[PDB]
C-alpha cells in the first residue's frame, strides 16, 4: 500500500476511420504545486503503439523502463522483430494489464491509469484502458481521471457508437481532441497549457507532436462580471 506523490492528470483518446489519436499534458503536479513542466506522459512503443499514462510519475517511469525492456527482449533471437513478429498494441496492453492486476493482488499497486493506443498489424484500431485495480475496458473514446468526466462527453458527440468510427476523419477527430484539451485547461486545476499529441494511422504511420499549446481561449466576458451577487462596480 502506497500513496501518489508526483502526479500526471488526464490522458484523452479516441479512434477514427484509419487509426487512433491520444493526448496528454506535460505537467507533473506535487499536490497543489505545479512542480514539473517538462514531463512527457505519452510513451511510443515501436511505430504502431503509444502508451498514455496518468497518475504517479515515479510509477510511470518504472512502466516506461518495462516497455523499453520489452522491445529489447522481443528483438532477442528474432529475425522478424521489425516485421511479422513485431510488438502489437494488444501484446503491449495485455502485458501491462497482467502486471497491474498482479501488483494490486499483492497489495502493492502501480498508482496509474493507462490507455494503450495503436493500430494492429491487420489495420484494426486498438484502444484499451487499464488502471491500478487491473480493471480493463475498450470504448470508441477513452479518458483517464478528470477527462473521463469532461472530455468523454465531448468526444462521444463525434463518435457515439461503433458505426460512427468509419465516418470520422483525422481532421474532425484531432479537432475534438484539441478542443477537449482546452476544456480540461478551463476546469481542471491540475492541468497544463502545454501538451503532446500522437496520431497512429494505418497509412501514414506514427505522428508524434510535441510542445502544443491551448489556443483560442475565451476570457473576455470576465470584465463584465463584478462581485458575487449585489455588487455593481
Amino acid at each position: 500500500t502506497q500513496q501518489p506523490i508526483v502526479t500526471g492528470t488526464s490522458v484523452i483518446s479516441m479512434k477514427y476511420d484509419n487509426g487512433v489519436i491520444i493526448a496528454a499534458d506535460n505537467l507533473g503536479s506535487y499536490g497543489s504545486l505545479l512542480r514539473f513542466n517538462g514531463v512527457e506522459r505519452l510513451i511510443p512503443v515501436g511505430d504502431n503503439t503509444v502508451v498514455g499514462i496518468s497518475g504517479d510519475i515515479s510509477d510511470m517511469q518504472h512502466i516506461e523502463r518495462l516497455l523499453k525492456d520489452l522491445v529489447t527482449e522481443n528483438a532477442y533471437d528474432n529475425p522478424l522483430a521489425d516485421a511479422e513478429e513485431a510488438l502489437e498494441p494488444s501484446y503491449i496492453f495485455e502485458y501491462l494489464a497482467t502486471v497491474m492486476y498482479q501488483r494490486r493482488s499483492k497489495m502493492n499497486p502501480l498508482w496509474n491509469a493507462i490507455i494503450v493506443a495503436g493500430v494492429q498489424s491487420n489495420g484494426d484500431q486498438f484502444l484499451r484502458y487499464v488502471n491500478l485495480l487491473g480493471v480493463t475496458y475498450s470504448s470508441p473514446t477513452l479518458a483517464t481521471g478528470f477527462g473521463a468526466h469532461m472530455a468523454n462527453p465531448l468526444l462521444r458527440k463525434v463518435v457515439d457508437r461503433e458505426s460512427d468510427i468509419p465516418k470520422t476523419t483525422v481532421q474532425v477527430a484531432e479537432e475534438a481532441i484539441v478542443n477537449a484539451m482546452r476544456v480540461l485547461y478551463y476546469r481542471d486545476a491540475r492541468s497544463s497549457r502545454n501538451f503532446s499529441l500522437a496520431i497512429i494511422d494505418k497509412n501514414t504511420g506514427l505522428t508524434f507532436k510535441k510542445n502544443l499549446q491551448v489556443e483560442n481561449m475565451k476570457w473576455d466576458f470576465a470584465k463584465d462580471i463584478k462581485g458575487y451577487g449585489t455588487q455593481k462596480i
Binding site: 523502463r65 525492456d69 529489447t72 528483438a75 532477442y76 533471437d77 529475425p79
Partner: protein, 140 residues
C-alpha cells in the same frame, strides 16, 4: 599417478586444468567464426554448414544480440553458447537497471569472463565448450 583429467577443478602436476583443455577440443572441432574491428565499429561473420538440402536457408541464425549494441558469435557446442548469451542478456539488463546507461563492452567482457571462470572452480559443473567472439560500440 594419473586421473587428473577426470575431474574439473583438479590441478595436474604441471598446474594445468585438463577438463578445460578438453573443452577447447570441442571448440576446435566446431564451425569457424570471425570478428573484425574497424575504424568505428565491429563486424561478425560465421560459417553455416549445410548438412542437407532440407535445411531452410536464412533461418538457423547463429549470431546473437545482447542488449541492442552487442553482437555475439561462438564456435563449438551451440547450446553452451546460447546459455552464455542468456546469462549475458541478464547481466546486461542488470547493469542497465541500476546504472541507466547501456553496458560498456569491456564491462560486458568481464561479466562473461567471471561467469566462465566460475565453471572451472567446481567439479559439479562442466566448462563451456565454446569460444565466443563479441563486441560493439559504447561511450568511447
Amino acid at each position: 599417478g594419473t586421473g587428473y583429467d577426470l575431474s574439473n577443478s583438479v590441478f595436474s602436476p604441471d598446474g594445468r586444468n585438463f577438463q578445460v583443455e578438453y573443452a577447447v577440443k570441442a571448440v576446435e572441432n566446431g564451425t569457424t567464426s570471425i570478428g573484425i574491428k574497424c575504424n568505428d565499429g565491429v563486424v561478425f561473420a560465421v560459417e553455416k554448414l549445410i548438412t542437407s538440402k532440407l535445411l531452410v536457408p536464412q533461418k538457423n541464425v547463429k549470431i546473437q544480440v545482447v542488449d541492442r549494441h552487442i553482437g555475439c558469435v561462438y564456435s563449438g557446442l551451440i547450446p553452451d553458447g546460447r546459455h552464455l548469451v542468456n546469462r549475458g542478456r541478464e547481466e546486461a539488463a542488470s547493469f542497465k537497471k541500476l546504472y541507466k546507461t547501456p553496458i560498456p563492452i569491456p564491462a560486458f567482457a568481464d561479466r562473461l569472463g567471471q561467469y566462465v571462470q566460475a565453471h572451472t572452480l567446481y567439479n559439479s559443473v562442466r566448462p563451456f565448450g565454446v569460444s565466443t567472439i563479441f563486441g560493439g560500440v559504447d561511450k568511447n
